[PDB]
Amino acid sequence: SLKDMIDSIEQFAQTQADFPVYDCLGERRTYGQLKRDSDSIAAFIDSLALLAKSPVLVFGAQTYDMLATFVALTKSGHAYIPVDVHSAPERILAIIEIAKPSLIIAIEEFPLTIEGISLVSLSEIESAKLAEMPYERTHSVKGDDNYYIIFTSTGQPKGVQISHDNLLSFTNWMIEDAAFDVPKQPQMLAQPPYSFDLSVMYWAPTLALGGTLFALPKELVADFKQLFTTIAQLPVGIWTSTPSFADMAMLSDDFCQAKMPALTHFYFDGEELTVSTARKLFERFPSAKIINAYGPTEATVALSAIEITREMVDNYTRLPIGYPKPDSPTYIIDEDGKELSSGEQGEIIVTGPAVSKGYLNNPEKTAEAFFTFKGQPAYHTGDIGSLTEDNILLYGGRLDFQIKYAGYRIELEDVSQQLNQSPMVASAVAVPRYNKEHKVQNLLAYIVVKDGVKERFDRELELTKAIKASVKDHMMSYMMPSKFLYRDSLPLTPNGKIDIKTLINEVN
Numbered sequence: 001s002l003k004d005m006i007d008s009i010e011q012f013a014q015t016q017a018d019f020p021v022y023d024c025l026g027e028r029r030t031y032g033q034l035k036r037d038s039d040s041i042a043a044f045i046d047s048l049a050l051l052a053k054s055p056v057l058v059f060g061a062q063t064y065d066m067l068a069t070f071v072a073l074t075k076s077g078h079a080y081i082p083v084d085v086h087s088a089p090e091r092i093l094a095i096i097e098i099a100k101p102s103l104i105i106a107i108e109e110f111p112l113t114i115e116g117i118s119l120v121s122l123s124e125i126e127s128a129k130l131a132e133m134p135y136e137r138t139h140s141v142k143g144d145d146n147y148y149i150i151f152t153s154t155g156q157p158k159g160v161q162i163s164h165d166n167l168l169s170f171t172n173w174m175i176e177d178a179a180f181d182v183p184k185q186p187q188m189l190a191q192p193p194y195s196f197d198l199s200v201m202y203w204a205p206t207l208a209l210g211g212t213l214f215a216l217p218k219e220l221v222a223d224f225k226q227l228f229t230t231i232a233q234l235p236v237g238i239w240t241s242t243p244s245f246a247d248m249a250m251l252s253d254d255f256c257q258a259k260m261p262a263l264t265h266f267y268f269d270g271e272e273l274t275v276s277t278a279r280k281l282f283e284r285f286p287s288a289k290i291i292n293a294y295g296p297t298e299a300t301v302a303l304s305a306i307e308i309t310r311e312m313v314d315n316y317t318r319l320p321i322g323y324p325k326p327d328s329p330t331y332i333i334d335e336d337g338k339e340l341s342s343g344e345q346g347e348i349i350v351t352g353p354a355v356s357k358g359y360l361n362n363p364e365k366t367a368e369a370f371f372t373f374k375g376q377p378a379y380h381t382g383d384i385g386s387l388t389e390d391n392i393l394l395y396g397g398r399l400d401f402q403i404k405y406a407g408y409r410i411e412l413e414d415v416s417q418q419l420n421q422s423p424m425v426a427s428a429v430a431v432p433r434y435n436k437e438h439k440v441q442n443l444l445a446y447i448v449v450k451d452g453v454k455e456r457f458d459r460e461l462e463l464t465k466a467i468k469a470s471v472k473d474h475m476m477s478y479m480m481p482s483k484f485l486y487r488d489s490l491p492l493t494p495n496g497k498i499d500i501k502t503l504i505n506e507v508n
């Protein structure tokens with residue numbers, strides 16, 4: 001039972017000094033090296049004489065130096081704020097205005113100029129490792145101390161603060177959980193950027209269990225042909241990503257058990273995992289375990305998980321989001337805040353030791369979303385779901401996407417997953433068209449169809465009717481959207497999710 005994240009990696013430094021913690025394409029760093037480098041960087045940090053417990057902004061991609069630096073900031077009592085290299089500069093500016101970092105560490109080159117705050121170069125961070133200064137922990141981040149602050153975009157950005165205690169509640173669960181079923185010294189693909197709290201689903205278990213991270217070069221992240229081929233050469237056992245990223249992977253010929261024989265586990269979190277995605281996945285990898293995991297950043301990465309089965313792919317029309325965690329009581333509530341019994345629909349709220357203390361310096365949004373329930377810190381997820389008698393959590397969608405149409409209670413994500421049932425559809429997004437009144441004139445759907453479908457059909461109209469014919473026996477009549485918008489792929493957010501908002505806007 002994990003007592004402290006640092007202690008763990010300190011132990012792997014004695015116990016397994018020569019085992020690799022990091023790998024970028026055969027270039028490697030070890031647990032012994034991570035201790036040595038992070039100790040030296042911590043000493044560097046203390047020498048700067050910053051405000052105690054002030055947060056530090058760390059700008060970069062996925063290199064070894066990001067991690068070594070994170071660990072140093074932890075050792076030396078400072079929350080880190082991962083900002084990813086591909087961020088809008090106005091966004092980077094926003095984070096700084098909100099968070100008031102005492103320092104910025106530019107692990108990759110920093111494309112803004114602000115006087116006011118100290119800036120530390122990559123070359124400086126390198127020099128520090130190579131100086132090899134020792135380090136004695138005396139004022140490491142503990143208890144409810146901020147460990148990291150991740151920024152969430154709804155439009156305007158907010159900074160979720162996650163404590164050492166929050167992180168340990170998530171991590172102890174992950175590594176004991178029968179769905180996740182994490183192997184010793186796990187060999188984890190490290191695709192999600194550090195600025196997305198999904199990165200935690202790989203670094204925290206890995207470090208807690210003595211594994212190895214497999215990172216990719218930043219210049220490789222836009223070349224989609226090379227990316228999946230390069231990935232396939234890697235001895236990775238676990239794939240951690242958003243469902244979308246794996247849909248993208250599903251185009252490559254090489255994303256199969258044949259070319260990736262070490263890969264046994266898929267960990268998905270962040271957006272709906274689709275029945276089809278799981279289907280294609282099991283074809284490509286018949287033996288692999290698949291895990292859907294759920295939660296907002298505000299409750300430390302994920303609060304429920306469950307293993308997805310073939311029974312589940314053969315029968316369900318939507319995949320469940322799993323067993324809530326023992327230490328995080330989860331509840332369904334109506335619009336007057338009363339707790340409902342199993343099967344009924346309402347907001348998903350979560351409580352307990354993994355619930356963030358709130359957004360940094362945004363007391364208004366904090367007061368909207370965080371509150372106390374049954375004596376315990378709680379968070380409004382904004383999601384509609386339900387809990388079953390056997391305690392499995394089910395996902396309905398976002399409150400902001402429950403709409404009224406022909407005076408109804410329509411969940412957009414329902415129309416989407418209904419349409420995704422059709423054999424000719426890869427990915428479907430139902431979307432509202434408005435008029436002058438902020439009222440709903442009609443439903444539309446964006447459609448991406450499967451391979452060899454576009455070419456069995458001479459005209460869009462045959463296709464649309466063929467599609468509607470394939471799920472009319474299931475779909476209620478008021479829910480079938482009238483118009484389809486075909487696309488070859490869907491836009492994604494920086495974090496790799498289907499960009500529902502932008503899709504809604506491009507029709508209004």
Ligand SMILES: Nc1ncnc2c1ncn2[C@@H]1O[C@H](COP(=O)(O)OP(=O)(O)OP(=O)(O)O)[C@@H](O)[C@H]1O
Nearest residue numbers: 152153269270271272273293294295296297383495
């Ligand atoms: N397994 C899942 N299935 C369905 N939906 C999910 C799942 N996991 C997460 N979500 C959705 O993602 C939300 C969490 O969002 P998150 O904390 O990533 O921030 P965000 O506001 O979506 O933007 P960003 O990703 O940039 O932070 C949940 O509210 C839920 O709507």
